[PDB]
């Protein structure tokens, strides 16, 4: 749509290591990154997309903002699929990552895929949402099968940052019906009105 920075977070936990998708979803999540990357890259000739994996490997910085997928794909194969998903320390380090962009006038946006419920407390998410609201940080939450075996722990995070769709606080849920991988984000307001799909 417009010029903005997107920070992607991959989910690696005990549920991702177990049976998830017939293509070995950890490899399909790599394709899920390719789906949103090709959509945002074709929208504007200059774009900044970061990669941060905080699930089970402790908070780390893999690759910085770049317009090429060469170094992004190679770094995902060397990660670990074990551990647990921690979104408490993953979202806090992503706020400082937003300052890595060149022009500060770009819109701050964070797109995170959550395939498993987090074990961390929800008290840290209350003060984190109020801080991201002052800086106008677009929050994109993709929940895959999280609302079935557990409640929504990120609902309190969205309630404090709650804003109309013209700014931030976008909460989405993956349709349980079987469909193609790139089609799940097509109907959802993620790759809509972009260069490709």
């Amino acid at each position: 749509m417009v010029l903005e920075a997107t920070v992607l977070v991959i989910d690696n936990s005990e549920y991702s290591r177990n049976g998830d998708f017939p293509r070995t979803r950890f490899e399909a999540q790599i394709d899920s990154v390719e789906f949103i990357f090709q959509a945002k890259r074709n929208s504007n000739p200059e774009n900044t997309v970061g990669l941060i994996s905080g699930a089970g490997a402790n908070p780390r910085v893999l690759s910085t903002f770049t317009a090429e997928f060469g170094k992004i794909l190679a770094g995902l194969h060397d990660t670990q699929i074990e551990g647990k998903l921690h979104m408490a320390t993953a979202l806090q380090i992503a706020q400082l990552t937003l300052k890595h962009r060149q022009n500060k006038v770009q819109h701050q946006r964070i797109v995170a895929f959550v395939c498993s419920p987090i074990s961390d407390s929800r008290d840290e998410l209350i003060r984190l949402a109020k801080t991201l609201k002052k800086n106008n940080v677009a929050v994109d939450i993709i929940n895959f099968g999280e609302i079935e075996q557990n409640t929504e722990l990120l609902d309190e995070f969205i309630a404090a940052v709650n804003n109309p769709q013209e700014e931030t606080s976008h909460l989405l849920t993956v349709t349980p019906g079987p469909r193609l991988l790139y089609e799940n984000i097509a109907s959802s307001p993620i790759i809509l009105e972009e260069g490709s799909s």
Partner: peptide, 10 residues
């Protein structure tokens, strides 16, 4: 785990 998680069950 093969219904909600797994989309296909080969």
């Amino acid at each position: 785990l093969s219904t909600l998680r797994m989309e296909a069950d080969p």
